[PDB]
Design an enzyme around this catalytic site. Structure first.
Site, PDB file in Angstrom:
ATOM      1  N   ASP A 123       0.812  -1.218   0.000  1.00 26.27           N
ATOM      2  CA  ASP A 123       0.000   0.000   0.000  1.00 26.27           C
ATOM      3  C   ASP A 123       0.847   1.271   0.000  1.00 26.27           C
ATOM      4  OD1 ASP A 123      -1.939   1.925   0.300  1.00 26.27           O
ATOM      5  OD2 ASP A 123      -2.460   1.348   2.370  1.00 26.27           O
ATOM      6  N   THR A 124       0.995   1.860  -1.193  1.00 21.77           N
ATOM      7  CA  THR A 124       1.755   3.090  -1.356  1.00 21.77           C
ATOM      8  C   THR A 124       1.070   4.296  -0.731  1.00 21.77           C
ATOM      9  OG1 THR A 124       0.737   3.426  -3.518  1.00 21.77           O
ATOM     10  CG2 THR A 124       2.826   2.197  -3.433  1.00 21.77           C
ATOM     11  N   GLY A 125      -0.218   4.198  -0.427  1.00 22.78           N
ATOM     12  CA  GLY A 125      -0.951   5.245   0.254  1.00 22.78           C
ATOM     13  C   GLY A 125      -0.903   5.182   1.764  1.00 22.78           C
TER      14      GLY A 125
END
Ligand SMILES: COC(=O)N[C@H](C(=O)N[C@@H](Cc1ccccc1)[C@@H](O)C[C@H](Cc1ccccc1)NC(=O)O[C@H]1CO[C@H]2OCC[C@H]21)C1CC1
EC number: 3.4.23.16
Lengths: 99, 99
Positions: free
Chosen positions: B25-27
């Site tokens: 999850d880059t967020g």
């Protein structure tokens, strides 16, 4: 381009004729934008993350340009703390994770 | 490897000697795992997301293997709806976004 993850992967998007900053988020199924008045019909929806659910307006077939790459899909609009670009649009610009 | 985003980017991780499924999850600034018995000292912490804030245990300098890549860093444990690998460990395994 190639985006490292030392900082939040924030990029400029163009939507509804306006420029905004948004987070490229592989952990998001859907795209969620901060409150804005987009024209057209919409459907109520609830989206969940850590902490619970928020109420959003679902708009269909909205065009968004993400660093020069065009995507067309469903955009949710509501009281999110940050503009989030989710997988439904990241697939369209050919975005991959690499390690 | 190279991972496309047509499906959730779920991978197998090894933590505390146990195998689990987790979302790349880059967020997410931080790594948050569902309730589990991890060894070592921990500190109460609060983390916020799209729905609000949750209470978590912060464990420092935890070893976690993410698809064969070792990371040692901070792991938050709490009532998250899904196990998420955040940027603090994604940078350690050399993960980047490309499109
Ligand atoms: C189907 O369900 C979904 O797709 N839900 C999506 C969603 O919530 N995805 C999150 C991971 C996820 C996935 C499925 C269930 C729960 C959690 C993550 O990808 C995006 C989120 C963005 C953010 C929110 C508040 C402040 C800053 C950034 N980041 C986050 O919560 O991170 C926490 C942990 O790290 C810390 O840094 C940032 C905040 C802190 C919503 C967008 C559509």
């Amino acid at each position: 381009p190639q985006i490292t993850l030392w900082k939040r992967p924030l990029v400029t998007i163009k939507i509804g004729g306006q420029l905004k900053e948004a987070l490229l988020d592989t952990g998001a199924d859907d795209t969620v934008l901060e409150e804005m008045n987009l024209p057209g019909r919409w459907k109520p929806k609830m989206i969940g993350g850590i902490g619970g659910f928020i109420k959003v307006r679902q708009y269909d077939q909205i065009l968004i340009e993400i660093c020069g790459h065009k995507a067309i899909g469903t955009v949710l609009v509501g009281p999110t703390p940050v503009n989030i670009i989710g997988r439904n649009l990241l697939t369209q610009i050919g975005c991959t994770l690499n390690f």
